[PDB]
């Protein structure tokens with residue numbers, strides 16, 4: 001896999017963000033995770049967490065996996081990095097997302113994220129509390 005540039009347009013929620021990619025506005029849905037909706041328990045904390053991570057970043061990068069790059073809603077499917085740190089993994093590590101939506105072919109970082117989830121669960125963080 002490889003990282004490509006993007007710039008923030010707007011934070012949306014825990015697991016979606018609007019980025020300019022190849023000079024076009026796109027909504028990205030983070031691979032391999034599920035954050036609670038804003039109206040759900042931990043939804044606001046997830047949203048805030050992703051917001052801070054992407055807004056404070058000097059450098060946003062997107063990393064597509066080997067499979068489909070857009071979902072059925074037209075959302076980009078990617079790993080998103082903020083100054084080198086993967087948002088997807090950071091959410092899981094903090095107990096603010098569950099590993100989820102692991103589809104064959106877009107699962108390169110699955111075991112990395114599962115490892116993070118195990119550690120969040122051990123620590124009884126957030127969702128796992």
Ligand SMILES: Cc1cn([C@H]2C[C@H](OP(=O)(O)O)[C@@H](COP(=O)(O)O)O2)c(=O)[nH]c1=O
Nearest residue numbers: 029030031032033034071072077101103106
């Ligand atoms: C993360 C992800 C979601 N989706 C689709 C599956 C779900 O369809 P349904 O809308 O039919 O439930 C939806 C979940 O996204 P949200 O968690 O953002 O709602 O997004 C994919 O198709 N591929 C993916 O990799």
Ligand SMILES: [Ca+2]
Nearest residue numbers: 034035036037
């Ligand atoms: Ca969600």
